[PDB]
Protein backbone atom coordinates (compact mmCIF):
# COMPACT_ATOMS: atom_id res chain seq x y z
CA UNK A 1 0.00 0.00 0.00
CA UNK A 2 0.85 3.53 -0.65
CA UNK A 3 0.77 5.76 2.25
CA UNK A 4 1.81 9.80 2.53
CA UNK A 5 2.73 12.18 5.72
CA UNK A 6 1.91 15.77 5.87
CA UNK A 7 4.25 18.28 8.37
CA UNK A 8 3.23 21.17 9.16
CA UNK A 9 6.18 23.00 10.74
CA UNK A 10 6.86 25.93 12.34
CA UNK A 11 6.91 29.47 11.39
CA UNK A 12 10.36 29.65 12.60
CA UNK A 13 11.64 26.86 10.90
CA UNK A 14 13.58 26.87 7.45
CA UNK A 15 13.98 25.39 3.50
CA UNK A 16 16.99 23.99 4.27
CA UNK A 17 15.99 22.39 7.83
CA UNK A 18 13.26 20.42 5.73
CA UNK A 19 15.95 17.77 5.23
CA UNK A 20 16.99 18.00 9.25
CA UNK A 21 13.21 17.97 10.09
CA UNK A 22 11.94 14.92 8.23
CA UNK A 23 15.14 12.74 9.19
CA UNK A 24 13.02 12.14 12.37
CA UNK A 25 11.19 10.10 9.97
CA UNK A 26 14.48 9.05 8.32
CA UNK A 27 15.36 7.61 11.53
CA UNK A 28 12.05 6.65 12.17
CA UNK A 29 11.98 4.32 8.92
CA UNK A 30 16.16 3.49 9.34
CA UNK A 31 14.19 2.14 12.90
CA UNK A 32 11.63 -0.02 10.64
CA UNK A 33 14.03 -0.85 8.45
CA UNK A 34 13.80 0.93 5.16
CA UNK A 35 16.71 1.84 4.00
CA UNK A 36 18.21 2.95 0.16
CA UNK A 37 19.64 0.13 -0.34
CA UNK A 38 15.52 -1.79 -0.40
CA UNK A 39 14.17 1.64 -1.94
CA UNK A 40 12.65 -0.79 -4.41
CA UNK A 41 10.17 -1.98 -1.54
CA UNK A 42 9.57 1.09 0.01
CA UNK A 43 8.19 3.80 -2.17
CA UNK A 44 9.93 6.99 -0.64
CA UNK A 45 9.20 10.08 -1.72
CA UNK A 46 9.82 14.00 -0.23
CA UNK A 47 8.57 16.84 -1.32
CA UNK A 48 7.87 20.86 -0.04
CA UNK A 49 4.08 21.75 0.44
CA UNK A 50 3.19 24.26 -2.53
CA UNK A 51 -0.27 24.32 -0.72
CA UNK A 52 0.60 26.29 2.34
CA UNK A 53 -1.97 28.25 3.70
CA UNK A 54 0.09 30.03 5.83
CA UNK A 55 2.90 31.98 3.89
CA UNK A 56 5.07 32.78 7.00
CA UNK A 57 4.92 29.04 7.85
CA UNK A 58 6.41 25.98 6.09
CA UNK A 59 4.83 22.65 5.35
CA UNK A 60 6.59 19.37 4.03
CA UNK A 61 4.84 16.17 2.53
CA UNK A 62 6.47 13.12 1.92
CA UNK A 63 5.21 9.47 0.98
CA UNK A 64 6.07 5.76 2.18
CA UNK A 65 5.11 2.53 1.76
CA UNK A 66 4.54 1.17 5.04
CA UNK A 67 2.38 -0.61 7.44
CA UNK A 68 -0.05 1.94 8.85
CA UNK A 69 0.82 0.45 12.19
CA UNK A 70 4.22 2.27 11.79
CA UNK A 71 3.66 5.01 9.81
CA UNK A 72 1.67 6.56 12.63
CA UNK A 73 4.88 6.32 14.14
CA UNK A 74 6.16 7.64 11.69
CA UNK A 75 4.17 10.81 11.52
CA UNK A 76 4.83 10.52 15.44
CA UNK A 77 8.18 10.72 15.98
CA UNK A 78 8.27 13.99 12.70
CA UNK A 79 5.49 16.06 15.35
CA UNK A 80 7.13 14.82 18.20
CA UNK A 81 10.06 17.26 17.70
CA UNK A 82 9.25 20.91 18.62
CA UNK A 83 10.25 22.96 15.42
CA UNK A 84 6.92 20.98 14.45
CA UNK A 85 3.83 22.19 14.17
CA UNK A 86 2.09 19.01 13.35
CA UNK A 87 2.19 15.88 11.35
CA UNK A 88 -0.98 14.46 10.15
CA UNK A 89 -1.22 10.83 7.47
CA UNK A 90 -3.13 10.15 4.70
CA UNK A 91 -3.80 6.95 2.88
CA UNK A 92 -3.15 7.09 -0.37
CA UNK A 93 -3.07 3.35 -1.59
Not at 6 to 30: F, W, Y
Amino acid sequence: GIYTVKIVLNPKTNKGELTTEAVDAATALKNFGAKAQDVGVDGAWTYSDPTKTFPVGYRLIFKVEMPEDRVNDLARQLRQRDNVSRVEVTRYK
